[PDB]
């Protein structure tokens, strides 16, 4: 989540 | 009935108007969004974007929902093209479980505010001082034993 | 604000009022008022005269061409247009076809005694003709020489937007402007699918009929005036639509606008006339006046139109309630 | 070098002068110089002449169709050329609509009695009419027969790439030339913008008032002589230009240009031609002369041409110091 | 504003002209370079290059800055567009961390004639030839031991 979610959830 | 086109930086794509209809909310199904991108020269919609994602955008609205991403395309550049396109949370939401990555867990709370203090100072030992202080300890007694 | 505005998007500057033409000019009154009427309207500033094929059998546009052919003005002060549509009882003489449109309009520039109207219109939506004989028809007119621009009147906003993808998809010439009805009981039109048209593609509006043929100057109250247009014949559609109760039910509501034209200093023709130019989406007005005095007292609705204030405007739609859903 | 150049890159070949029209023709200088005048520039090789609709409220292209008419010449050997825009002061004669370039255009082939010219020349922009209608009006007066080619004047660099852009998408001509003005104390557009577009769309220059209407000319230092354009009615613009402190800020520049003519065996005028045809760039030069003598020592400047070499251009330069940012 | 028209060999690609007016340096960005490029028969710029190469061509001047490499295409040709199209130095170095070969790094020097010799001549064993006869006796020294 260090990839992932740094430019998913916005 | 009527078709529209949309020309994604010189890549021409053609679908019929109410497969937008699909979705009235995002930025293609709205007829007072995409008012601004529309080219009366040519009779269509001139976005200067990337190229390769649109193939995969527009499936999303053939298919009824379905997002997929393309192997070109990373996920740093697919998931800004979803932010511009509007698509929406759940849409946003499909991205995570097609690629696996999975939603984080909403814990519960002891809505008070003794329950609420000890609950996240010993669940959450990264939270205080003491907390990192609590699991410093907590090592020790099993290593110990 | 501004007296010249562009039809649309188009280069042609017409004047906000327009000096129509329906059952006065050939019909109902004399010629020798027409040329009056013409004169009053041209020396305030108003070119923009209309006229249609169907009027009066083909009579409003001999007695409109012998007015130009005897006053002398210029023809590139002026800016004449022109319907199409209705030309003959044959069945090959009524539609957009392109066999009609050519002959239609011809035949039109020999009563009008002119060598080309500057806007010929389409006056009504053909099924029969495909969309692509019609846009190819027009373009042929145009580059004749016959006509500068041509536009639309009585269409649907879908079927302007069909005749738009035609002309960019074979490279002819779309349309500029559109004649929609507009008055202060039917708004739906103008003002929730035109202004939608107008920043996307960059057609007009040119509304006709302002004052719903007489209804709302106010006169139709104790019943029917003689040597008014419901008095007339074949009116009859007119005079059993205000006859009947829901003109009544029209009428109830042009008492309590009576009075707001007193508080403003002017009449309910010219708070009428003056309602329509209140936005920027509608490029023309076109009046249509009996007698001279009609006529002077229409052309004086734009000082009326600073006075139009936010406050004015909002209370009349509490009066006439059919705003439509925007 | 080379007298006959083509324009732009087209296929017309002007003269690299050509005598053009303003307050002279049909106005100051009465109609016996002026074939006085043509005949002295036709026998010289000059073949293109200019006009305007809007010069002496059209009395300067009826006095350049009647010196046609009278002297016989060949209209397949002239090139006769007119800008339009200003033609009237109703609102609906002014500007490049599709109706105006039609009309206007049309009236002048009956002031100058012929039946075609071969430029027609948008004489400013018109930020109203959208670039589309303006390339389909002058199109379409092209493949009537009323010119043979068009340009612009006093456009941008960027409205005439606009204007190209327009005639390749929807397959219509391109403009050729431009007209801007170009003299010793205004050199920035023809010198560092026009160039651009040469080699990239190949349109040419064709550049006007080169002795800043008769400053350069060397007889404004002692103050306004008798019988000079200043000293005319509505040339106040001119001559309180002149009379203005920059104006002598010209003057005192004019002084040390006068001693390098005198130093080539020249005088002010032939310099201050010779200086603008120095280039490739600038395909002709529309002079504009009041009587004989001043245009036959005006034809005569191009044996200054070869003595104006990098030596002499360069300290010239040094002199006024209004040498663009290449 | 208004936007121009490149065609890489049959494919057009359409971007706004203020796009390439970020980069002002390289070939697509300077008036003067790609004037020799235009066709004023079809309003557009025609390179005969490679095809699928552009495409990350152009999203370098789109996102910025990245610059990317597709799958299709190998280094050796990559590299060669970059070097036709002159993106520059910066954006040459950063198709060096993007595909994760790592620059060289500039050895010190001590500035003189004296330890200048001798600093080459031990670390550096592939120098001279006895910087090759002092790595062969090196080796003994730690055997033998
Ligand atoms: N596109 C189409 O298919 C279409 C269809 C119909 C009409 N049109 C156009 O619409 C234009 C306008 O025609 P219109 O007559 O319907 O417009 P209108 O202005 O709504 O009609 C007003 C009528 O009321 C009367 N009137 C005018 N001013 C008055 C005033 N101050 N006080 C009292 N009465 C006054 C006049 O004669 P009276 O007093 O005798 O009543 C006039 O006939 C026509 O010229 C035609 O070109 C187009
Ligand atoms: N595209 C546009 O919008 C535009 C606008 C304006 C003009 N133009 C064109 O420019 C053309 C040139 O007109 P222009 O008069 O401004 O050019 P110009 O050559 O700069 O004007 C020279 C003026 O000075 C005088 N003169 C000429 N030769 C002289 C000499 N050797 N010695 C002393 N005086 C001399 C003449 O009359 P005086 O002695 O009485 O002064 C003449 O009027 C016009 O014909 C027109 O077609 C185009």
Known sequence: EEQSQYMHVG | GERVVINISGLRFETQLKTLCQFPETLLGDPKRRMRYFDPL?????????????????????????????????????????????????????????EGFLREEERPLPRRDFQRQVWLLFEYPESSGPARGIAIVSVLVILIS | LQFYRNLGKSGLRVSCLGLGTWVTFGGQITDEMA???????????????????????????????????????????????????????????????????????????????????????????????????????????????????????????????????????????????????????????????????????????????????????????????????????????????????????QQAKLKELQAIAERLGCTLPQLAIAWCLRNEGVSSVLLGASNADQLMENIGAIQVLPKLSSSIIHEIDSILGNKPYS
């Not at chain 2, 393309?70 to 698509?87: A, G, T, W």
């Not at chain 3, 739906?188 to 057609?203: A, R, Y």
Request: aromatic share 12%.
């Open chain 2, 42 to 98: 040519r009779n269509e919609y001139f976005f200067d974007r990337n190229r390769p994602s649109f193939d995969a955008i527009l499936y999303y609205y053939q298919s009824g929902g379905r997002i997929r991403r393309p192997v070109n395309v990373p996920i740093d550049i697919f998931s800004e093209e979803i932010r511009f396109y509007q698509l929406g949370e759940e849409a946003m939401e499909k991205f995570r479980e097609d």
């Open chain 3, 35 to 249: 040329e009056q009427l013409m004169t009053l309207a041209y020396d305030n500033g108003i070119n923009l005269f209309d006229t249609a094929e169907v009027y009066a059998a083909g009579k409003a546009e001999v007695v409109l061409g012998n007015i130009i052919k005897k006053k002398g003005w210029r023809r590139s002060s002026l800016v004449i247009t022109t319907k199409i549509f209705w030309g003959g009882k044959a069945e090959t003489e009524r539609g957009l076809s392109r066999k009609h449109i050519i002959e239609g309009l011809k035949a039109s520039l020999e009563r009008l005694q002119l060598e080309y109207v500057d806007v010929v219109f389409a006056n009504r939506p053909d099924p029969n003709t495909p969309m692509e004989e019609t846009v190819r028809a027009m373009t042929h007119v145009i580059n004749q020489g016959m006509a500068m621009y041509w536009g639309t009147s009585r269409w649907s906003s879908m079927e302007i937007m069909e005749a738009y993808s035609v002309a960019r998809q074979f490279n002819l010439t779309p349309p500029i402007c559109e004649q929609a009805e507009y008055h202060m009981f039917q708004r739906e039109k103008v003002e929730v699918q035109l202004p939608e048209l107008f920043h996307k593609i960059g057609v007009g509006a040119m509304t006709w009929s302002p004052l719903a043929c007489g209804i709302v100057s106010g006169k139709y109250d104790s019943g029917i005036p003689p040597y008014s247009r419901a008095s007339l014949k074949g009116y009859q559609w007119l005079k059993d639509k205000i006859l009947s109760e829901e003109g009544r039910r």
